[PDB]
């Protein structure tokens, strides 16, 4: 039976995984208001504890979805959309291909790549972050 | 500006430190779901940057609202309610009076007092928090 003081202390000592690019903070910076799906993928991609169902392939801003539905799940629980499946999220990607935000690598299945200038936006180089995330 | 780094860096070299009792954490702790007005008041009282509009009087869990409107304005923002004024906020305080969470100090204006067992919930004593926030008693 611990107090709030113990609760905070325990949280500071246990759950330790801060994404380098918080989708929320990013929406503020860019002033996009409501969190965007492409901004969310970045947060996950910048959060080690997510390298299970999503990570950088090592080639530039190229990333792959090891477990698509997982990203589709969290995305739903993050935007109060408990009705978010794998397709309702794969439809937003096409919109991203046309607006040239995210693309799909030829000769893959769930491999994608940011084609927008994230270096000038985020301030990080692809290779830089890869290191901060122990990318292999 | 410039890059995302700067906008976040200015938060580590040009930004204060979090309050002691953040409403968000307190909500998750007690599992109240959405932030509660009394939890939000606790955050402002545990944040040095808010001592201009709300502060501890120095006597236990008693506090005063030096700038009532600024409190109601910030509560409105945190809850996405731009039409938030003190009058409505006062409806929440009155509600807490009936639920023995916060009482109003007789013979004074804008002076209230948490009357629930916050010490046992929070893990701090009023004196302890007053020191952490460099609180100075009022010459009542």
């Amino acid at each position: 039976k611990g107090t709030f003081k113990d609760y905070v202390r325990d949280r500071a000592d246990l759950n330790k995984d801060k994404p380098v690019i918080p989708a929320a903070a990013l929406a503020g910076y860019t002033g996009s208001g409501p969190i965007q799906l492409w901004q969310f993928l970045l947060e996950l991609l910048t959060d080690k504890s997510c390298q299970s169902f999503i990570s950088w392939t090592g080639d530039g801003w190229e990333f792959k979805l090891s477990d698509p539905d997982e990203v589709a799940r969290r995305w739903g629980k993050r935007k109060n959309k408990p009705k978010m499946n794998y397709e309702k999220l794969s439809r937003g990607l096409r919109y991203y291909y046309d607006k040239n935000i995210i693309h799909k690598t030829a000769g893959k299945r769930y491999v994608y790549r940011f084609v927008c200038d994230l270096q000038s936006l985020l301030g990080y180089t692809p290779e830089e972050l890869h290191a901060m995330l122990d990318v292999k």
Side-chain angles (χ1 to χ4, degrees), chain A residues 77-90:
Chain A
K77 306 180 184 304
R78 180 58 179 291
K79 291 286 290 179
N80 187 196
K81 198 60 176 174
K83 47 197 65 181
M84 172 46 78
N85 66 304
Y86 161 70
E87 198 198 308
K88 188 185 297 181
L89 170 136
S90 52

Side-chain angles (χ1 to χ4, degrees), chain A residues 45 55 79 111 136:
Chain A
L45 283 172
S55 64
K79 291 286 290 179
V111 180
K136 299 181 181 176

Side-chain angles (χ1 to χ4, degrees), chain A residues 59-119:
Chain A
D59 176 34
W61 297 121
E62 194 183 23
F63 63 107
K64 62 181 184 55
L65 289 156
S66 292
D67 193 56
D69 188 62
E70 235 294 318
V71 185
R73 193 200 68 161
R74 310 169 86 92
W75 180 224
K77 306 180 184 304
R78 180 58 179 291
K79 291 286 290 179
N80 187 196
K81 198 60 176 174
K83 47 197 65 181
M84 172 46 78
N85 66 304
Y86 161 70
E87 198 198 308
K88 188 185 297 181
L89 170 136
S90 52
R91 53 186 60 184
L93 290 175
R94 261 292 135 294
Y95 171 70
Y96 285 143
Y97 165 67
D98 300 305
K99 296 297 174 179
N100 294 290
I101 282 187
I102 292 168
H103 275 193
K104 191 278 183 172
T105 304
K108 310 295 181 175
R109 170 74 295 192
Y110 288 122
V111 180
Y112 297 80
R113 182 198 301 271
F114 281 99
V115 283
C116 56
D117 189 5
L118 293 181
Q119 273 217 49

